């Protein structure tokens, strides 16, 4: 089932322990592997004591739809994973943010949903968890230890985030109009005006493919195609010590910019390696992360490298004929 990128699932020994601010793209990935980022989100926003993801890690998180394709690739980054790396922000839920029906919000402490204008998260505090509907957090004595399993987390939709190639606004307007033409029925998506209607049905579930292009709102699609290109970058690689764990920034920088470390074939054909010296010792090894590559989508005659792309459930209001 998926598997960790670098670091196995955590076994946390104290719920009051702190969440350190590590600086390397490997230490960050390791914290992602162990759901340290989602636990931090809980501590800040929902005033929550402890860690979520004990012994499970990111790989044991629950998805909706549960048959989640991207999950099978450990390298593909969920909206929370991009949050921990700075690529985007998952906002704290407000009253207006509509909780979509269909997922199994029961016992969940955290769940995350891509919205039409961004990414939103709902949390529960200490000793509480979500009721069947997801509208309320209520006392849950099975959440009392503060060292909670990974299935308490719910990531909605088959989403995968990456480094975009920025697009000019003229391209965004082209792509925004084409989506409007393709979904003329829709009035609002997640409260954001999409078409001009003057008569709107009540909010309704909406399953749609979308893409984050780095502008105000996502662009939803019906007819699109995808292609998983392999484009080498530094973030294609994580560097690790086989027993110490993730390496430090200065070490990993020395690996990726100085050809001083070791690693698998693709890394050596990017940065540089060496062998025939290691007697017993220990030196950082760098390996390729497990993903098909960077995703490129074709839509409206144009071809874009998005920040995030996936098929999730948003809330849309339709026309009243």
């Amino acid at each position, epitope marked *: 089932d998926s598997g960790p990128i670098i670091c196995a699932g955590p076994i946390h*020994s104290n719920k009051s322990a702190g969440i350190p601010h590590l600086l390397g793209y490997s230490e960050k990935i390791c914290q992602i592997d162990r759901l340290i980022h989602v636990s931090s989100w809980l501590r800040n926003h929902s005033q929550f004591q402890g860690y979520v993801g*004990q012994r499970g890690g990111r790989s044991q998180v629950s998805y909706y739809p549960a048959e989640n394709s991207y999950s099978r690739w450990s390298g593909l980054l969920s909206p929370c994973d991009a949050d921990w790396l700075g690529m985007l922000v998952v906002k704290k839920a407000r009253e207006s943010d509509m909780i979509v029906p269909g997922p199994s919000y029961k016992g969940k402490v955290f769940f995350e949903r891509p919205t039409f204008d961004g990414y939103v998260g709902w949390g529960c505090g200490s000793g509480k968890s979500r009721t069947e509907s997801g509208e309320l957090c209520s006392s849950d*004595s099975g959440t009392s230890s503060g060292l909670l399993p990974s299935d308490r987390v719910l990531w909605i939709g088959d989403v995968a985030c990456q480094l975009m190639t920025p697009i000019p606004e003229e391209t965004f307007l082209e792509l925004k109009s084409f989506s409007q033409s393709e979904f003329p029925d829709i009035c609002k998506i997640d409260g954001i005006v999409f078409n001009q209607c003057e008569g709107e049905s009540l909010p309704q579930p909406f399953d749609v493919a979308w893409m984050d292009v780095g502008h105000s709102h996502k662009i939803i699609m019906r007819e699109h195609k995808t292609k998983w290109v392999q484009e080498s970058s530094s973030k294609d690689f994580v560097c690790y010590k086989e*027993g110490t764990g993730p390496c430090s920034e200065s070490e990993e920088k020395a690996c990726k910019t100085s050809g001083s470390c070791r690693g698998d074939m693709q890394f050596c054909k990017v940065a540089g390696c060496e062998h025939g010296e290691e007697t017993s010792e220990a030196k950082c090894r760098c390996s390729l992360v497990h993903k098909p590559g960077e995703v490129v989508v074709s839509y409206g005659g144009m071809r874009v490298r998005p920040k995030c792309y996936g098929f999730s459930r948003m809330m849309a209001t339709l026309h009243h004929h």
Partner: T-cell receptor, first 113, second 108 residues
């Protein structure tokens, strides 16, 4: 505040079945994994079994696997260990143990008598 | 699976001395190790978790260190109550394992 009151011990003969119970007070029992650790005369400690907060996850040592069954009623705040097919190797003192996380990961924090 | 080995089996030391028990794990368990004090009649007591952390309410003379396979438990200044048997326990693999132990006697 956090106490564990064991009961059920006695004199049973080889091939008989005893039942042990561990009443837990002072903490939210349903949110913590529990253990059973035993110590035979003249020997060291030996972990026996563990149960998760839900009861959904159980784990046993090799020396007792298939004979001893660990269970918990989280509505009465008591932990159980069901002994079967008992043997002279099992002659020991049986301690119940409270853990720190949802599962019984192996932090033997608060014991019984 | 994982078989812990402690050394020495026994150790005699007088009050005020430094007592350094060592524990060894057949495989790498990172820092998933605990240390326990057991005295005759009374139940075991948890001193160190994660191989270096002090349990709440335990004197600062007790310590712990190590990661990987080789670990250490040290009493900086022995006290009369500190005479008991001590155990190390791994929790990296789901079957938890106690080492053999180490009894602490008093030099006379």
């Amino acid at each position: 505040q956090v106490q564990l009151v064991e009961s059920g011990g006695g004199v049973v003969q080889p091939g008989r079945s005893l039942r042990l119970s561990c009443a837990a007070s002072g903490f939210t029992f349903s949110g913590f994994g529990m253990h059973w650790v035993r110590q035979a005369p003249g020997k060291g400690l030996e972990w026996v079994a563990l149960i998760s907060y839900d009861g959904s996850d159980t784990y046993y040592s090799d020396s007792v696997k298939g004979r001893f069954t660990i269970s918990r009623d989280n509505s009465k705040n008591t932990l159980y260990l069901q002994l079967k097919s008992l043997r002279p190797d099992d002659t020991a003192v049986y301690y119940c143990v409270g853990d720190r996380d949802y599962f019984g990961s192996g932090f033997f924090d608060h014991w019984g008598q | 699976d994982i078989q812990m080995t402690q050394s020495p089996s026994s150790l005699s030391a007088s009050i005020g001395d430094r007592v350094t028990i060592t524990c060894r794990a057949s495989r790498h368990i990172t820092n998933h190790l605990n240390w326990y004090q057991h005295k005759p009649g009374r139940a075991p007591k948890l001193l160190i978790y994660e191989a270096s952390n002090l349990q709440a309410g335990v004197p600062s003379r007790f310590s712990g260190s190590g990661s990987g396979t080789d670990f250490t438990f040290t009493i900086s200044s022995l006290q009369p109550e500190d005479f008991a048997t001590y155990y190390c326990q791994q929790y990296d693999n789901l079957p938890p394992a106690f080492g053999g132990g180490t009894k602490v006697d008093i030099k006379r």
